[PDB]
């Protein structure tokens, strides 16, 4: 069945499970060519991103189809729709799989032969297969007990030279470190409470942020039961996972519980099997973003302030109305012990499969899948205004510029219901004729996906701390939503074989979709793959295996739901930092929806051509695999930006080609292999070339994916890679000299934003090593990704706050920007003269806050890194020690994940593996003070009975 | 107002250091064309009732006027066509000012006597007062043409025919229907007192003029300094300079008079205040008739309208009979000076867009000959009430702001959007 005409990679469960990760796919980061796998954050329960051969979908569905046995597994993401003010990520549908349950994962990277799975297989397939019952000794019980810690990996590198102040001057209530160079002298700080004030030495506390963090801790327990006969098998498993992350208190929390029971029974020509699985989850997120969020509050701390001294709330100076600074942040310990962001989900999925063999060469199969989920979010904020405003500095002493305005409390709750059903009807025919071999299978596929939720919210909490829809004197806000889409299709997959040497397969599939215009819902897509193992019938025996493959094929695709017709929404108006919605005042109103529909759309069509080679030498002691692919995604249906003066802000239409060409390359070999010792190396390499080819130019050939209003924005532009950033840049004279304001000394903005990079790695590769010696196992895996940029609010804040090491630049003495001029303009004769205006000490703060000489583009940070991804020390106890014991096998295990990261010198701020805008395309925009990545290490005990 | 010293949300508005890519208008452009003007197009497609069409046309015209007074050119005649023209050409402000004035005319003449059968939160189906809203906009635009010296002769006789008919609106043209809860407040309040923290402090021109005139209105919207209990304005774009000169500790919010948000939670949104209406007639009388007695009548109608709205009815005496009184003004220009300055006060905390545009048309308040740094060094040089070019000024040509950038959304998706000019180039009707 490796008559496959395109690249794929197979991983056995033993390697998936061995990293002891809560999730199936994050242990695979950097180990498979062409499979880009990254976590959104180190926050427990976060989503994972998986993107195969680059982005094709401009918004925003690039995850591979996960097919578990083999039924489409639902893999929807639950993350915050506003990552600037309240970023949270609650998880990814594939996370529910118990990794201990996996037998083999095959990842199919090719979109040439997709008739089996349909449209969603164009982003690739993750073909999981779960363990089955087996005969063995003795009782069939496997136990896995885990324990693990996490610590913070990379904090921003801080200046330790200047303490609390602004404009270079000493203040007692600043959120920033633009004060004087440290003396060691006795200064005042913080508010004054009851006619007394805190007075401490004016020295730096280099570890103040480092010591705020705890060690995360995580226990896990997995149990399985299996048995078989010669007619049946049964497998039943339980897994539990309890995570409390490094952020102090229980606010990083993830609890996972899974239960699963699968069985088969053959009777004659008939086999029936079923697999039914239940998954539970409770996440608690420490919300990120620019307001009274924890980390924003934490980064805006003077370098002389002890953070762990701020925790005791019986010290009145830490009480919220006397907290030392009032500048739009709060005590992080108060935010963590008093704000609620909670998620809970129960989920049931399973399949029924009936196989019936007849007439010697035919097999009928019916397979039904059902995936259903209910989730409940609960978010609350205390009503800070009525709790602390009158009587306090922070407080009515700050008036309209208080952090309690209008923090009047909020509480909401959402309940979400998802349910996918998939039905497969297949008859397969398979007969050898001479040395030839014919495999023919035709099938029907029905699919139905539905999601709905209801949402309700109250503001202005009467009793300030109680989060309950009853606790407000003001109107509630309610929302409800429902989507339903359906697909049917027939498909056929003919596979010819000659003498285990020449494999040639052709596919063909025509779908009908609800989400396309009625006049055009049928789309057809064929595909041809071939395979030829030339070492079979080439002597020696030095070429263990030699395979060459080719594929040419199309997959179709429909749109997202409800994009054909004009809608009227209930009239609302998005205004800076707020809305003005109807009803007013008693009247309700409907506005024409701001996205223009289209009844002329055609199906999406993805075309791909791929060649590849696979050779092995010296009894599989040296192997390589290489693939060359050329994928274009055409006519993709997208809500494309349009000039609002047309009447709409976007129009649904078919785009042009998004192209990904690239090379995937995998080389492994075992230099050393004796009886007791083996050493294997593995090197995989990927280089993908992203190019948008055309965006319908009648609307311009640019469209926003994600961006701040008048700030750094990521785009799709006609001739360029997906995800190019535009950012503000300094003006420059014809000679490359930086133009500077003749009075203040600070750089002048250019007319336009500058194109300042794309989101794409230029290349990404991994290097791995495995050593076995007498049942001792040692694995080391390195992940390398180089190229691309990413917005980093982590930097932006430590520049603005004056805590980054870069801001200690001219040792903060007034300075002229090197190589600076002034633009002298008299009506229309522009002339540049040498600048003699310095940045004053009082304005140094603003030179850095706006980004120095880069201006905004400074906060585009190089995405590159090398990571020591995972290390796994494993010890299979010698079987003789297990003799007067009930144990068949014991293996103790020590592992670390995400252990160390190296980055270019231009990035001393973040682990590039962060986001705030999800696990798909918009996540590449950057990180909006995501919580800092963690380093995880643990033990695992495996006991077989 | 200016930027409060201890926050930062509007540094670039204050120092004119914004650019086209700062999108300082992109939200408003969106909700004006893809919201207001599209719904108007559909209303026009769905009803055949003249009075509804009439009041709809007036709100459509009002939206075009706003855009034109921001960017001179605006889409029009080719806008609101969806996929038939996703890139509408930008008509010159003059072609749309004549256009929308033609539309109001055609719609008024279409009236038949039948009532409005539509929810009207401006006038509650009072056809008479939509008529007055439409004449008030004619007055407003007729005078734009005259001071732009474009067909001034005829628009001069129409503006006089308009004012002697006196067929204007009573009370104020406002959307008063906000509540102090959530997504239902005054937009400005919501954005600047709920969404953001306090960013606004009083500007120096306003505070020096109100305190010079001995005006009690100075307590409405403006609070005393917490440091000392006085009224202190900040010189335009001078936040960073006062901190440089006085030290960080002696130019905090404590030292400058804050804009008071508490009156704004449910405050209406004004399209045409009555004080402004009278001040425009007081101008037409004083300047195209020669009817001092009537000009003075409409001038005092203006001061006492605005005095009642802010809750100071009975106290217009303090600027009407106090010094800056219609008679301590000998030249006819000193009296037009009086009208424009009291129009300027009456528009604070009411209709700021219209204040700026009338500042551009009459160029009164004048621009001070003295720079921010000089005014700060010895205040005696400054005559209270005239504008001050920002201390740091991102306009290569200095002076005051004359127009707003084109929307970045229009720039990126409409090939025909006029090339970005600097904020110093005037709109088509500001000719001095």
């Amino acid at each position: 069945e490796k008559a496959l005409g395109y690249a794929a990679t197979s991983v056995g469960g033993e390697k998936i499970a061995e990293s002891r990760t809560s999730d199936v796919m994050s242990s695979l980061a950097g180990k498979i060519a062409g499979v880009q796998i990254s976590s959104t954050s180190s926050d427990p329960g976060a989503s994972n991103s998986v993107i195969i051969r680059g982005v094709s979908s401009l918004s925003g569905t690039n995850q591979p189809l996960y097919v578990v046995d083999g039924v489409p597994l639902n893999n929807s993401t639950v993350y915050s729709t506003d990552g600037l003010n309240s970023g949270y990520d609650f998880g990814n549908g594939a996370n529910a799989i118990n990794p201990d349950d996996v037998a083999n994962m095959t990842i199919l990277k090719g979109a040439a032969a997709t008739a089996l799975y349909g449209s969603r297989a164009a982003n690739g397939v993750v073909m999981i297969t779960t363990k089955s019952g087996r005969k063995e000794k003795g009782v069939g019980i496997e136990y896995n007990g885990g324990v693990q810690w996490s610590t913070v990996l990379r904090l921003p590198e801080f200046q330790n030279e200047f303490g609390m102040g602004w404009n270079g001057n000493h203040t007692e209530l600043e959120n920033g470190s633009w004060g004087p160079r440290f003396d060691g002298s006795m200064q005042l700080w913080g508010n004054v409470y009851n006619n007394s004030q805190k007075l401490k030495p004016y020295v730096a506390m280099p570890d103040n942020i480092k010591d705020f963090f705890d060690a995360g801790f995580r226990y896990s327990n997995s149990l399985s039961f299996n048995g078989a006969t010669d007619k049946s098998d049964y497998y039943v498993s339980f897994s539990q996972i309890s995570d409390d992350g490094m952020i102090p208190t229980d606010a990083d929390s993830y609890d996972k519980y899974t239960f699963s029971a699968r069985g088969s029974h053959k009777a004659g020509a008939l086999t029936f099997s079923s697999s039914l699985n239940y998954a539970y989850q409770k996440n608690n997120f420490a919300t990120t973003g620019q307001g009274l969020s924890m980390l924003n509050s934490l980064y805006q701390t003077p370098r002389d302030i002890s953070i762990i001294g701020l925790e005791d709330q019986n010290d009145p100076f830490n009480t919220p109305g006397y907290y030392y600074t009032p500048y739009g942040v709060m005590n992080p310990y108060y935010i963590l012990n008093n704000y609620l962001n909670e998620y809970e989900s129960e989920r049931f999925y399973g399949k029924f499969q009936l196989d019936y063999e007849f007439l010697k060469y035919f097999k009928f199969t019916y397979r039904m899948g059902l995936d259903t989920t209910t989730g409940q979010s609960d978010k609350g904020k205390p009503n800070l205004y009525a709790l602390y405003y009158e009587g306090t500095p922070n407080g009515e002493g700050q008036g309209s510029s208080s952090p309690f305005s209008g923090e009047t409390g909020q509480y909401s709750e959402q309940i979400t219901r998802r349910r996918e059903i998939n039905q497969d009807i297949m008859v397969n025919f398979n007969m050898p004729v001479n040395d030839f071999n014919i495999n023919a299978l035709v099938g029907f596929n029905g699919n139905e996906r539905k999601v709905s939720y209801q949402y309700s919210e109250v503001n202005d909490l009467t009793i300030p701390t109680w989060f309950n829809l009853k606790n407000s004197g003001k109107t509630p806000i309610v929302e409800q939503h429902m989507e339903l889409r359906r697909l049917m299709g027939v498909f056929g997959q003919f596979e010819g074989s000659w003498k285990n040497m020449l494999y040639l397969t052709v596919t063909a599939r025509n779908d009908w979709s609800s989400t396309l215009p009625k006049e055009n819902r049928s789309f057809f897509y064929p595909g041809i793959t071939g395979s030829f193992i030339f070492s079979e019938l080439l002597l020696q025996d030095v070429i263990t295996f030699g395979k060459i493959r080719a594929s040419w094929g199309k997959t179709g695709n429909d749109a997202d739901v409800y994009m054909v017709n004009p809608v009227y929404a209930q009239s609302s108006n998005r205004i800076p930092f707020g809305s003005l919605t109807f009803p007013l005042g008693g009247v309700n109103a409907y506005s024409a929806g701001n996205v223009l529909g289209s009844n002329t759309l055609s199906p999406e069509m993805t075309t791909e051509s791929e060649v590849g080679l696979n050779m092995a030498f010296f009894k599989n002691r040296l192997s390589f695999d290489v693939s060359y692919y050329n994928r274009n995604t055409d006519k993709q249906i997208f809500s494309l930006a349009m000039d609002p003066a047309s009447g709409y802000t976007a129009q649904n239409m078919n785009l042009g080609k998004i192209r990904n060409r690239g090379i995937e390359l995998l080389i492994s070999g075992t230099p050393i292999r004796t009886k007791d010792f083996s050493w294997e190396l593995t090197w995989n390499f990927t280089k993908n070339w992203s190019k948008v080819i055309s965006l319908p130019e009648e609307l311009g050939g640019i469209t926003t994916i994600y961006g701040l209003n008048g700030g750094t924005s990521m785009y799709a532009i006609t001739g360029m890679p997906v995800g190019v950033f535009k950012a503000q840049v300094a003006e420059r004279d014809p000679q490359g000299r930086i133009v500077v304001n003749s009075s203040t000394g600070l750089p002048v903005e250019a007319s336009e934003f500058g194109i300042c990079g794309d989101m794409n790695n230029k290349y990404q590769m991994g290097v791995s090593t495995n050593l076995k010696y007498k049942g001792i196992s040692l694995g080391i895996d390195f992940d390398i990704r180089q190229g691309g940029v990413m917005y980093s609010r982590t930097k932006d804040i430590n520049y603005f706050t004056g805590n980054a090491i870069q801001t200690a630049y001219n040792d903060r003495n007034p300075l002229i920007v090197p190589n600076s001029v002034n633009k002298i303009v008299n009506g229309e004769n522009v002339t540049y003269v040498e600048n003699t205006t310095p940045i004053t000490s009082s304005n140094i703060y603003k030179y850095w806050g706006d980004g120095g000489s880069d201006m905004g583009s400074c906060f585009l940070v190089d995405k590159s890194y090398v990571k020591l991804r995972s290390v796994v020390l494993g010890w299979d106890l010698p079987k003789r020690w297990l003799a007067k014991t009930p144990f068949q096998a014991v293996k103790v295990s020590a592992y670390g994940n995400n252990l160390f990261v190296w980055t270019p010198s231009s990035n001393t701020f973040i682990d590039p593996e962060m986001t705030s805008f999800g696990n798909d395309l918009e996540g590449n925009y950057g990180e909006y003070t995501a919580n800092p990545s963690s380093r995880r290490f643990g033990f695992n005990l495996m006991v077989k009975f | 107002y200016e930027q409060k010293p201890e926050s930062n949300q509007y540094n670039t508005l204050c120092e004119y250091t914004f650019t086209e890519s700062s999108q300082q208008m992109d939200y408003s452009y969106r909700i004006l064309f893809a919201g207001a003007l599209e719904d108007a197009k559909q209303v026009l497609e769905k009803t055949t009732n003249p009075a509804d069409r009439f009041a709809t046309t007036i709100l459509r015209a009002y939206a075009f006027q706003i855009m034109v007074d921001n960017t001179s050119d605006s889409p029009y005649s080719e806008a609101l066509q969806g996929n038939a023209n996703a890139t509408p050409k930008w008509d010159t402000g003059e072609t749309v000012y004549k256009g929308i004035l033609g539309e109001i005319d055609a719609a008024e003449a279409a009236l038949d006597g039948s009532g409005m059968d539509v929810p009207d939160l401006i006038f509650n189906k009072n056809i008479a007062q939509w008529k007055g809203f439409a004449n008030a906009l004619r007055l407003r635009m007729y005078l734009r043409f005259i001071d732009a010296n474009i067909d001034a002769a005829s628009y001069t006789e129409k503006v006089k025919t308009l004012v002697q008919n006196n067929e204007f609106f009573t009370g104020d043209v406002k959307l008063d229907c906000f509540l102090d809860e959530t997504d239902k407040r005054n937009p400005w309040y919501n954005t600047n007192a709920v969404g953001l923290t306090g960013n606004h402090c009083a500007a120096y021109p306003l505070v020096s003029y109100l305190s010079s005139t001995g005006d009690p209105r100075i307590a409405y919207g403006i609070s005393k300094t917490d440091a000392d209990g006085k009224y202190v304005g900040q010189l335009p774009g001078g936040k960073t300079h006062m901190q440089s000169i006085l030290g960080t500790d002696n130019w905090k919010n404590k030292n400058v008079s804050a804009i008071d948000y508490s009156i704004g939670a449910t405050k209406p949104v004004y399209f045409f205040t009555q004080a402004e209406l009278q001040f425009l007639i007081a101008e037409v009388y004083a300047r195209f008739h020669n009817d001092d007695a009537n000009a003075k009548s409409a001038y005092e109608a203006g001061v006492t309208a605005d005095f009642a709205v802010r809750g100071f009815a009975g106290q217009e005496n303090t600027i009407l009979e106090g010094a800056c009184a219609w008679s301590a003004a000998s030249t006819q220009a000193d009296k037009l000076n009086l009208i424009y300055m009291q129009k300027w006060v009456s528009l604070f905390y009411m209709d700021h867009m219209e204040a700026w545009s009338e500042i551009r048309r009459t160029d009164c308040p004048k621009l001070s000959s003295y720079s921010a740094a000089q005014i700060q060094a010895s205040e005696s040089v400054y005559t209270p009430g005239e504008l001050v070019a920002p201390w740091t000024n991102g306009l290569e040509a200095g002076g005051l702001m004359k127009r707003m950038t084109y929307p970045l959304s229009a720039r990126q998706q409409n090939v025909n959007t006029p090339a970005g000019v600097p904020g110093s180039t005037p709109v088509w009707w500001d000719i001095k």
């Binding site: 739009g328 800076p576 700030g711 924005s713 | 926050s7 969404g195």
Partner: peptide, 10 residues
Amino acid sequence: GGGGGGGGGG
């Protein structure tokens, strides 16, 4: 773009 963003305090 879309989505606001506030300056800090100092």
